[PDB]
Design a protein around this nucleic acid. Structure first.
Lengths: 39, 168, 56, 112, 56
RNA sequence: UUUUU
RNA sequence: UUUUU
RNA sequence: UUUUU
RNA sequence: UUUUU
RNA sequence: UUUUU
């Protein structure tokens, strides 16, 4: 049975790419403006 | 037969034909490495920060150890940058005893993190045991979505690299 | 033989040559984590919100 | 650990058995444990590793004959095998003697 | 640096022995994340190539 | 030499 | 060590 | 040749 | 060196 | 930190 177990564990895991990062929360698509308006 | 690592006959600087500059007394010169960087503040500035803060809270008592400790946990779970405002808080029992926020920052001679690299092993052991009991993770990590529960040890704003860390 | 996680001989802050700042009484300091964030309001503001609404 | 006492012999011994039954690599975290009676008296894990001047196994090749005799007698009574072997599925019960992370080859071993 | 290329063998032997005792690495390396602990010998701002070095 | 969870 | 619906 | 914080 | 909310 | 109708 020691063989058959390892065959199961290996058969049920393939293609799963770990990729320890998820996604970052910090977005900056465009920097902050910091300018004014007048008439 | 035995000898020492450096020898006078090694090639060395030669300003004068006779006199050598690097005096061979280095065999006992072993300062702890981390104390020498630039990314850490001085021994002086850390001291004055600890003295100047005490007046503006006006404690003059050893409750300061609690207040300092009450700061570092909050210093984990939210960012560290000069653009903070509002308040901060530690809790006891079930209430939310708060405090002000300004004088810690503005009476910080270089920037904040430039002081707070001292706290490396303290918070390390802290999240270690809290991870031992229950599955802990800070906010600085959850905001950036790590999958490996194991590397909570290395999630801070303030964390000082050394030659001791692993290559992972 | 048994001991505790933190030890006094751990490397720690050294303002004075003698006195240590982080007093070793942290072995029982286990606040519920979520109560400590900034993204949540305070216990105070939640209370006043519940009181001020009732009048209006 | 701040012991300054000859309990160190027990703690050292309590490490090597655990050092068998799980891997040895710098990427360990958490805790480790020995037991007495029926409880699970645990300890921390960091300072053994980080205060290891070269890497860990580079120290632990000293322990060769100790753990050897250890698993020999435990195999004598009952059918023992570590985890480092069961993770790699040996069929011959007899070669448990040569299953470690740390094991130092010599000119004495057989050719099998 | 145009002055400090003189110091080549001094700092070399220095980090050699400190690496002998304990696992030393400078900041110029840790900022650039080497994996091989062995090549701390060749991590400086100032280091003067010669015909003596190996091809690694 | 390192890299065996 | 994690990852087996 | 300079430019490596 | 700074800049991580 | 804000900004999710």
């Amino acid at each position: 049975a020691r063989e058959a177990i390892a065959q199961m564990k290996a058969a049920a895991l393939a293609g799963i790419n770990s990729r320890l990062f998820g996604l970052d929360g910090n977005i900056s698509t465009n920097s902050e403006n910091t300018e004014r308006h007048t008439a | 037969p035995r000898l020492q690592k450096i020898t006078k006959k090694m090639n060395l600087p030669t300003v004068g034909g006779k006199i050598i500059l690097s005096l061979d007394h280095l065999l006992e010169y072993k300062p702890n490495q981390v104390d020498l960087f630039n990314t850490r503040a001085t021994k002086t500035q850390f001291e004055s920060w600890y003295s100047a803060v005490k007046v503006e809270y006006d404690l003059n008592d050893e409750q300061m150890g609690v207040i300092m400790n009450g700061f570092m946990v909050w210093c984990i779970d939210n960012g560290t940058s000069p653009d903070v405002n509002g308040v901060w808080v530690m809790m006891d029992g079930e209430e939310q005893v708060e405090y002000p926020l300004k004088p810690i920052v503005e009476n910080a001679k270089p920037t904040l993190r430039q002081i707070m690299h001292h706290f490396s092993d303290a918070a390390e052991a802290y999240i270690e045991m809290r991870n031992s009991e229950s599955p802990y993770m800070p906010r600085y990590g959850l905001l950036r979505n790590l999958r490996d529960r194991e590397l909570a040890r290395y999630a801070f704003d303030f964390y000082e690299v050394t030659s001791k860390t692993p290559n992972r």
